[PDB]
């Protein structure tokens, strides 16, 4: 039994079909991720990605930042996260400009200027909102005790 085979049955491509690269688990997870899922509009793709990344970013800042022990530590953490989101958003904007150009036509192809702009917008809204949600959640932590 061989669990490693040439990818796509092409013995000369620079890739291999390993259990990690091509397993039902990996295929399933990647197919349903917002980035590659089928049917999602550019805006929704960005939104989901943003919602996911914003929620986990408030943590590092809130618990290890300069004002962690201050009563306003969580608030400061939120502000810091928003700042990071802005930096990342600038990057997305700039990338789109260089990679796609100035006027597009295909449409509904994440890889076009219009679609990219919509994607970026979604990310910003989702990320900032997600960070806010974490702020509300971390304001009062449940002990789940009966």
């Amino acid at each position: 039994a061989n669990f490693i085979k040439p990818y796509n049955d092409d013995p000369f491509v620079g890739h291999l079909a390993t259990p990690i690269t091509s397993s039902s688990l990996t295929r399933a997870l990647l197919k349903n991720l917002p980035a590659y899922r089928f049917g999602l509009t550019p805006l929704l793709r960005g939104l989901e990605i943003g919602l996911a990344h914003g929620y986990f970013l408030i943590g590092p800042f809130a618990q290890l930042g300069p004002l962690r022990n201050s009563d306003i530590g969580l608030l400061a953490g939120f502000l810091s996260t928003i700042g990071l989101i802005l930096i990342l958003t600038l990057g997305l904007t700039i990338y789109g400009a260089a990679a796609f150009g100035q006027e597009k036509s295909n449409g509904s192809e994440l890889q076009t200027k219009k679609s990219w702009d919509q994607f970026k917008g979604g990310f910003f809204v989702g990320a900032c909102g997600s960070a806010g949600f974490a702020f509300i959640c971390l304001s009062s932590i449940p002990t789940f005790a009966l």
Binding site: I4, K5, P6, Y7, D10, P11, F12, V13, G14, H15, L16, A17
Partner: protein, 132 residues
């Protein structure tokens, strides 16, 4: 007609699909093991064989190895993304190391290397001394 190989992570990448690609072909009289430039060992087939690579040098390197097996019928081509193909080597059917009547000289200067012009003389000209 692909030789028997199990795959590698040293094969071609996107450039081969969007910029340009190469291919070598040869005929063998026996099935033998050769080492491929990408990395690893493969077994050639008894007859026609075709292999794809990303660089001309990689193809010509394999040709050197083939000559050791006494194979001198190799041909190298460049396939563009649209499907256009260019025959590259042996270009005129005769290996370059053998003078073939019908080939014209190119990039030849009729004087010793020391007779090239002085850099200052060609200043503000755009040409170089070796092209002057």
């Amino acid at each position: 007609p692909f030789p028997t190989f199990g795959g590698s992570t040293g094969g071609w990448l996107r450039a081969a699909e969007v910029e340009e690609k190469y291919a070598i072909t040869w005929t063998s009289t026996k099935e033998q093991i050769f080492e491929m430039p990408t990395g690893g060992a493969a077994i050639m087939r008894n007859g026609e064989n075709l292999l794809y690579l990303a660089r001309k040098e990689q193809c010509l390197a394999l040709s050197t190895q083939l000559r050791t097996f006494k194979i001198n019928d190799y041909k190298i081509y460049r396939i563009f993304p649209s499907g256009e193909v260019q025959y590259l080597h042996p270009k005129d059917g005769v290996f370059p190391e053998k003078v073939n009547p019908g080939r014209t000289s190119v990039n030849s200067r009729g004087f010793s290397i020391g007779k090239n012009p002085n850099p200052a003389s060609i200043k503000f000209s755009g040409i170089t001394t070796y092209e002057s």
